[PDB]
Structures are given as structure tokens and as C-alpha cells.
């Protein structure tokens, strides 16, 4: 609040304008980064009420209706595990809207595969989508269909191990 200090500071020119401009550029760059990473879909996809995916369990990654934040258990664990003229500007996208974007991406990739990323979302059964992914890596569809229960059990076990590993590693 010193007037004499500000009068002497005016002799140095537009240094303060340069610093404010650089900080403003950084602040808008963070919002641009968040838009580029998370806002890649213009349709908010939602999962069907019946979670019949051929044995595949997505409860640990889909949003929990019981939680007010509408986050997944994994996302909730991630949020729990992360802890003089200065101002902190809030981010343009809040955490619930970012969670909504991730939920839309999860619903699109579960119900439609990769179709929603290239155009209109085309529905496909999840085992058939998994078979398509198997064909992408050079394994025939029959292997996926014959061992579907084993693949679903392994996927559920791996997702549980991921949650345990995140909860158990500082």
C-alpha cells in the first residue's frame, strides 16, 4: 500500500504487465489443457440401467450412485489419496464435470466400442466388442468366445488388484 514505492516502481516500466501477462497465459493454458484432455466428446453417454455385459464387472470404474460426488470407487480413492497479492483462480472445469466427462467416455467405450470416437455411437454387445479387440491383436474370435468366463474372471480380478494396489501403495 506504499504510494512512494509504487511511484518508484513506475520508473522501471512495464515489468509488472509482462509478469501478469505471463501468469495469465499460464492460467488460460491450464484450462486449454484440461479441455484438450477431457473434452473430446460432445455427447454425454450413459450406461444402461441393467449391467449385463456378459460377465464383465465395471462397478469399480463406473460412477457410484450412493456417492454425492458421482465418482467411481477408484476415482474416489484417487481423490482421497491426493492431498500478499497472491490469488488462486479456480479451474474452469470442476471435479464433478470432469468426472462426468470420464463417465461419458466410459459409457461410450463400454456400450459402443471405438465407434463413438469416429462418429455416431453404434451399439454393440460387449463380448463381441472384446472379440473385435482380440482380432485387432491377431487372435481369432473363437478363443474369446470359448474362454469368455475365464476372461471375465481375470478382468474382474485384475480390476480388484488395481484397487487394492492403489489403496496399499503410498
Amino acid at each position: 500500500d506504499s504510494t512512494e514505492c509504487s511511484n518508484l516502481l513506475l520508473q522501471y516500466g512495464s515489468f509488472c504487465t509482462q509478469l501478469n501477462r505471463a501468469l495469465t497465459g499460464i492460467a488460460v493454458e491450464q484450462d486449454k489443457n484440461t479441455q484438450e484432455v477431457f473434452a473430446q466428446v460432445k455427447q454425454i453417454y450413459k450406461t444402461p440401467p441393467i449391467k449385463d455385459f456378459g460377465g464383465f464387472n465395471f462397478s469399480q470404474i463406473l460412477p457410484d450412485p450412493s456417492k454425492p460426488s458421482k465418482r467411481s470407487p477408484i476415482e474416489d480413492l484417487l481423490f482421497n489419496k491426493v492431498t500478499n497479492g497472491l490469488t488462486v483462480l479456480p479451474p474452469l472445469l470442476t471435479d464433478e464435470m470432469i468426472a462426468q466427462y470420464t463417465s461419458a467416455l466410459l459409457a461410450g467405450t463400454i456400450t459402443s466400442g471405438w465407434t463413438f470416437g469416429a462418429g455416431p455411437a453404434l451399439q454393440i454387445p460387449f463380448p463381441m466388442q472384446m472379440a473385435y479387440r482380440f482380432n485387432g491383436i491377431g487372435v481369432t474370435q473363437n478363443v474369446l468366445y470359448e474362454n469368455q468366463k475365464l476372461i471375465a474372471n481375470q478382468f474382474n480380478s485384475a480390476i480388484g488388484k488395481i484397487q487394492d494396489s492403489l489403496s496399499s501403495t503410498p
Binding site: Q43, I44, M128
Partner: protein, 50 residues
């Protein structure tokens, strides 16, 4: 206002139904990428001292 992310689109998922495209659109999009800047040189002695 509170901003809206996108229009809601509930995909009609079921265990035995598929959606197959019957037509296509040839879409051309633009992507602008900067490559270079203006090459500026400053004579340090002449700038500071003339």
C-alpha cells in the same frame, strides 16, 4: 449460467443388438499448426548503448 458439457445421448445397449451403418459421409476438416516464428536479432550493444 452453469455450462452444459454436451447433449445427453443414452446408447440403447442390449446383449444381442448391433448398429450397422448403411451410408457414409466424406468429411474434410482443417488443422492449423504453426511451424516457425519471425527471426528476430537484437544487437545487445546497440540496444543498450546506441
Amino acid at each position: 449460467y452453469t455450462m452444459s458439457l454436451g447433449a445427453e445421448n443414452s446408447v440403447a445397449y442390449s446383449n444381442n443388438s448391433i448398429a450397422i451403418p448403411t451410408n457414409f459421409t466424406i468429411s474434410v476438416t482443417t488443422e492449423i499448426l504453426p511451424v516457425s516464428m519471425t527471426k528476430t536479432s537484437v544487437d545487445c550493444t546497440m540496444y543498450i548503448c546506441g
